Design a protein around this motif. Structure first.
Motif, PDB file in Angstrom:
ATOM      1  N   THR A 101      -9.800   0.830  -2.965  1.00 39.71           N
ATOM      2  CA  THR A 101      -9.080   2.076  -2.709  1.00 39.71           C
ATOM      3  C   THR A 101      -8.816   2.739  -4.055  1.00 39.71           C
ATOM      4  O   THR A 101      -7.797   2.498  -4.701  1.00 39.71           O
ATOM      5  N   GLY A 116      -2.981   3.971  -2.417  1.00 40.47           N
ATOM      6  CA  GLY A 116      -3.796   2.778  -2.531  1.00 40.47           C
ATOM      7  C   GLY A 116      -2.951   1.524  -2.485  1.00 40.47           C
ATOM      8  O   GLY A 116      -1.725   1.555  -2.516  1.00 40.47           O
ATOM      9  N   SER A 152       0.830  -1.195   0.000  1.00 40.31           N
ATOM     10  CA  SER A 152       0.000   0.000   0.000  1.00 40.31           C
ATOM     11  C   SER A 152       0.868   1.250   0.000  1.00 40.31           C
ATOM     12  O   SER A 152       1.730   1.423   0.866  1.00 40.31           O
ATOM     13  N   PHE A 172      -7.952   5.930   4.772  1.00 41.50           N
ATOM     14  CA  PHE A 172      -7.483   5.944   3.392  1.00 41.50           C
ATOM     15  C   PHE A 172      -7.706   7.347   2.840  1.00 41.50           C
ATOM     16  O   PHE A 172      -8.849   7.750   2.603  1.00 41.50           O
ATOM     17  N   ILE A 220      -2.471   4.031   5.649  1.00 43.43           N
ATOM     18  CA  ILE A 220      -3.612   3.137   5.478  1.00 43.43           C
ATOM     19  C   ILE A 220      -3.544   2.053   6.546  1.00 43.43           C
ATOM     20  O   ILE A 220      -2.563   1.306   6.625  1.00 43.43           O
TER      21      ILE A 220
END
Ligand SMILES: [Mg+2]
Ligand SMILES: [Mg+2]
Ligand SMILES: [Mg+2]
Ligand SMILES: [Mg+2]
Ligand SMILES: [Mg+2]
Ligand SMILES: [Mg+2]
Ligand SMILES: [Mg+2]
Ligand SMILES: [Mg+2]
Ligand SMILES: [Mg+2]
Ligand SMILES: [Mg+2]
Ligand SMILES: [Mg+2]
Ligand SMILES: [Mg+2]
Ligand SMILES: [Mg+2]
Ligand SMILES: [Mg+2]
Ligand SMILES: [Mg+2]
Ligand SMILES: [Mg+2]
Ligand SMILES: [Mg+2]
Ligand SMILES: [Mg+2]
Ligand SMILES: [Mg+2]
Ligand SMILES: [Mg+2]
Ligand SMILES: [Mg+2]
Lengths: 195, 139, 175, 191
Positions: free
Chosen positions: D165, D178, D94, D117, D101
């Motif tokens: 995401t 993301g 991520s 997020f 996140i």
RNA sequence: GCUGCGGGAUGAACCGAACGCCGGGUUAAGGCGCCCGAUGCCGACGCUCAUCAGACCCCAGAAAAGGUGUUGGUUGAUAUAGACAGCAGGACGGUGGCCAUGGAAGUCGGAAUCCGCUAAGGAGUGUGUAACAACUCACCUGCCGAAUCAACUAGCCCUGA
RNA sequence: UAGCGACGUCGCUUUUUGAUCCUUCGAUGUCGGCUCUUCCUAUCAUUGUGAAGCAGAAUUCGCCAAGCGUUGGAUUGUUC
RNA sequence: GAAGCUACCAUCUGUGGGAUUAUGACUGAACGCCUCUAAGUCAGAAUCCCGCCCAGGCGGAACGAUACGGCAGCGCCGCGGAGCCUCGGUUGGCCUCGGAUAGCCGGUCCGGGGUCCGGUGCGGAGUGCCCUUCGUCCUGGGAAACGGGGCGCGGCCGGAA
């Protein structure tokens, strides 16, 4: 004096033309299990066709206009009516000979069903062609009884399974009896004239 | 799956057409729709017949591709297809259909009269076997 | 030209009328594919008029004979030369076919042209038809058959009798 | 041009047993079992050989578009064998440029809960497909290991997590944030 | 108009055909899944899949242009002296060459454009730096191993609509 | 070739005008405004999206998209 | 100014499921690689359908009561008798599901697996049973111990779409 035609596996128009031609002669036709009638082409294509048909409606008074049916039995009935001369007395009298029904009711579960090979999808369409089921197509547009239809179909299938098991046991006993009584039954005539 | 194949030396049965009801030998495939057939001992000349016109059988013969009649008839007689053709359950059913079609009125009457004697004894024995099975499954 | 049914090979010889300026014409011959001798002579006249200064009135046909295949029992490969005419312009073409008879190969060529290119028989000029060996076969659809011990089943065979037992309790096995 | 025959052979290791009742293929190996229905391919599958058991795929009289599926079938069988032998493990890292996140597993890795997020207060809950287990790997920062048998399920769950995401009403080139699938491999090595 | 009749669903001019009242046979144009008489031929070859298919002179709909969607054709160029794709390695020196200038050191420009060791490297196909650096390509080679690449052409279908 | 795009060229529309006079001269009541229903999409905004010379915000170009809205007045009979 | 009507001139309420479009993706060949697609999967919205709501068909079900009064009247069971209107049939088939590159039958063993027959289907609808019977009587062979028809009784409702 009746023709109990199964519905599953048959193409919509290919079966409806045969039924419409056979009803005008006088044979009372009953199409059973109409939710299994397949339709050639993509499912989305047939859905778009049915939605374009739904869009057509009288503007000033929709109630006094085209009556769109949602059940697949009624869809097949309208398809056959489109070929029968329903505006004349002959077609009006012939329309009662056709009995389209969803599922296999009590008056018709015990009767043996007929299959018209001229409308079967296996011989009509290539194995690579896409087809759509009338049951799912109708359920996606304003049909609500698909669940109960499937439940009753499962029930009648579980019953017919036991019935066939009993019939197969009877057939086995019959073959055993035939093999047992070899003497006292020559029946050379049956073999010379081949049953 | 797919236990039958067309090839050089496959004997097939003609279902319909001018030579319906006879066996032929596929010499070679021409254009994936028709094949040359010889059938020397089945009283048919060499010609091209469609695949959908013929029905495949189980017997296979050893021919070289595009062989002559004097070389295909010898292998046909070596394989001895004609006499063993009657000793099968398929030609027997075909001959049975022919006899049932050749039935006359007296033959139909005799068959109908023999059915009365044949089926009734079978039914009275089935009625005993069923009760025997019921008594066996009773305890 | 119609090319109806099966075609037929005709050897047609013809020459102009003996004129006081010169006698004994070269007596040109042609090999025409036509259903019958009438259209065979018509196509021969058309071709000889397009080729040389000859017409039906100023000329004559000496002999027109059906030509039989030298080996009707042998599977042969034929190379067809086409001078066809499309909607935009005319083009030459080389095709290959596998058949027993030359007339059969020409029929297959006519049907395949009319099917694949929408070319009517009016604008199809058969240039040259010759039997070729398996080594000089450039087409893969024909070359895939030049293999001994060829084996393939016939899967999913159609019923072909949909209407004889039109009403039955059977479902065709198709195997 | 209606090619006569198209055949493709697939080798089978000693660990896995494969069976066919028809177009249905069932592979039983050390880690679970797989079963797939190929009723929409219309192609012959036949296993042959003792102690080798090679599976051949045969197509007769297929066009240019129908001759392509004979390789896809063998590729699917290869993927099934690979997943039943070693398994499929996707490492998804991520990117959290500013907002970290916070990913957590809910019930045996069957549910992923993503918090914070891009600073949004919305709680994104993504359920995994059956047979896929996800975990937070150690010795690395902000990554998720998704392990399973069926590749079409492992990668489907990975794509679901990746699409959960997704930036909206903003720039896609900017705001690189993301969970993206970084690595794809097997659970067992040396094979 | 002065003209009915069979087909074009419908109809002034279209296609056949012209007209007293009837019975039998045949046919023109047209048609044979059901309306509606006839293919219910164990019809032949091939093309076509549309989330806007297509279905017969007048006639009731469409163009330029495009498709690595398939199906045929033409002109060509490469490949056991081991190609085309894929994986991996090299991609140098004269030379940061000559006209420019705030910077051009193959990469914004004008003209040019060669040379030597090599197995091959092009005064350099592109990305990037204000420039240098960096990535990458033409080219050669290592593994695999036998066909492959490019441009046009026209039938159906698709976008254009 | 994000956005435009000349010189050329190919299409749709009858929401402008114009060309012809085919039905209407023993009459189809011929402008505008008020009230009211429905439909179309070549989408102004709103729902879900792709691309920018889209850092955010505000914007511009398209895609499936007519379900829901697209007002209050000054002068003009005014459509505009 | 009561009651009643009335005001966005006061007050209350106005709600979710599915397949999917555009689009973004998974596995994946065609085309050694790549690719959302060629077969198959995933998410997906004021759009589509339905859910809620509005009216219920020449649409059908469940249940109650079913004609006193003095001669009546009307139902159920078993019935023998006559006449009138209608139009149609000349044996009935009492049933597994499911595929079409696959399935049917038979079965030892551990609903599935293995093995053995059948497979242009013969435990087959080109099928099979009842059957093609003018009736009465005498008398022989085979089969038949269920008897063979029921205005008859008791046990089960066997089966609700
Ligand atoms: Mg409704
Ligand atoms: Mg913004
Ligand atoms: Mg006049
Ligand atoms: Mg006149
Ligand atoms: Mg006239
Ligand atoms: Mg007419
Ligand atoms: Mg004319
Ligand atoms: Mg005329
Ligand atoms: Mg007459
Ligand atoms: Mg005609
Ligand atoms: Mg008819
Ligand atoms: Mg179009
Ligand atoms: Mg018309
Ligand atoms: Mg008009
Ligand atoms: Mg093209
Ligand atoms: Mg006027
Ligand atoms: Mg008036
Ligand atoms: Mg008026
Ligand atoms: Mg609206
Ligand atoms: Mg109100
Ligand atoms: Mg898509």
């Amino acid at each position: 004096q009746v023709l109990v035609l199964d519905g599953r596996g048959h193409l919509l128009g290919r079966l409806a033309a045969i039924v419409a031609k056979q009803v005008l002669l006088g044979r009372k036709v009953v199409v059973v299990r109409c939710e299994g009638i397949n339709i050639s082409g993509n499912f989305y294509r047939n859905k778009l066709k049915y939605l374009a048909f739904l869009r057509k409606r009288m503007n000033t008074n929709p109630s006094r206009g085209p009556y769109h049916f949602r059940a697949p039995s009624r869809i097949f009935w309208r398809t056959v009516r489109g070929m029968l001369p329903h505006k004349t007395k002959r077609g009006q009298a012939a329309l009662e000979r056709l009995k389209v029904l969803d599922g296999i009711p009590p008056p018709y579960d015990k009767k043996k069903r007929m299959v018209v090979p001229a409308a079967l999808k296996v011989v009509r369409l290539k194995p690579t062609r896409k087809f759509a089921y009338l049951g799912r197509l109708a359920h996606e547009v304003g049909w609500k009884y698909q669940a109960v239809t499937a439940t009753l179909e499962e029930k009648r299938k579980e019953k017919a399974k036991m019935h066939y098991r009993k019939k197969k046991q009877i057939l086995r006993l019959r073959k055993q009896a035939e093999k047992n009584v070899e003497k006292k039954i020559c029946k050379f005539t049956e073999v010379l004239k081949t049953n | 799956v797919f236990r039958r194949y067309v090839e050089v030396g496959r004997v097939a049965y003609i279902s319909f057409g001018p030579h319906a009801g006879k066996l032929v030998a596929i010499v070679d495939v021409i254009d994936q729709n028709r094949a040359l057939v010889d059938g020397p001992c089945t009283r048919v000349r060499r010609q091209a017949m469609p695949f959908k016109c013929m029905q495949l059988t189980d017997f296979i013969l050893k021919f070289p591709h595009s062989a002559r009649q004097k070389y295909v008839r010898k292998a046909w007689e070596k394989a001895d297809i004609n006499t063993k053709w009657a000793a099968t359950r398929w030609a027997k059913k075909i001959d049975a259909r022919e006899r049932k079609a050749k039935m006359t009125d007296f033959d139909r009457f005799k068959v109908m009269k023999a059915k009365k004697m044949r089926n009734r004894i079978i039914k009275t024995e089935v009625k005993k076997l069923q009760r025997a099975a019921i008594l066996k499954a009773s305890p | 030209m119609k090319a109806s049914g099966t075609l037929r090979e005709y050897k047609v010889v013809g020459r102009c009328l003996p004129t006081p300026k010169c006698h004994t014409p070269p007596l040109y011959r042609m090999r025409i594919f036509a259903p019958n001798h009438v259209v065979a002579k018509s196509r021969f006249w058309y071709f000889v008029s397009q080729l040389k200064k000859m017409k039906k009135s100023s000329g004559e046909i000496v002999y027109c004979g059906q030509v039989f295949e030298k080996s009707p029992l042998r599977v042969k490969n034929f190379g067809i030369w086409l001078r066809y005419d499309s909607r935009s312009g005319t083009h030459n073409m080389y095709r290959e076919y596998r058949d027993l008879t030359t007339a059969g190969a020409v029929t297959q060529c006519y049907r395949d042209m009319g099917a694949r290119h929408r070319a009517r028989a009016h604008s199809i000029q058969i240039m040259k038809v010759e039997e070729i060996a398996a080594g000089k076969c450039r087409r893969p659809a024909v070359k895939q058959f030049h293999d001994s011990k060829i084996k393939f089943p016939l899967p999913h065979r159609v019923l072909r009798r949909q209407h004889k037992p039109r009403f039955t309790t059977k479902r065709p096995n198709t195997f | 041009m209606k090619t006569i025959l198209s055949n493709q052979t697939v080798d089978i290791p000693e660990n896995v047993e494969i069976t066919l009742k028809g177009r249905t293929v069932i592979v039983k190996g050390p880690r679970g079992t797989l079963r797939r229905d190929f009723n929409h391919i219309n192609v012959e599958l036949s296993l042959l050989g003792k102690k080798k058991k090679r599976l051949r795929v045969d197509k007769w009289w297929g066009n240019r578009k129908e001759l392509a599926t004979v390789r896809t079938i063998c590729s699917h069988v290869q993927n099934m064998i690979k997943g039943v032998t070693l398994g499929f493990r996707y490492k998804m890292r991520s990117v959290y440029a500013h907002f970290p996140i916070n990913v957590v597993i809910q019930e045996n890795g069957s549910l992923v809960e993503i918090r914070n997020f891009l600073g949004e207060k919305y709680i994104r809950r993504v359920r995994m497909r059956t047979g896929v287990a996800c975990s937070v790997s150690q010795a690395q920062k902000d990554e998720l290991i998704l392990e399973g048998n069926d590749i079409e399920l492992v990668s489907n769950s990975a794509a679901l997590i990746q699409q959960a995401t997704t930036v909206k009403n903003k720039d896609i080139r900017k705001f690189l944030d993301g969970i993206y699938v970084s690595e794809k491999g097997t659970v067992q090595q040396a094979d």
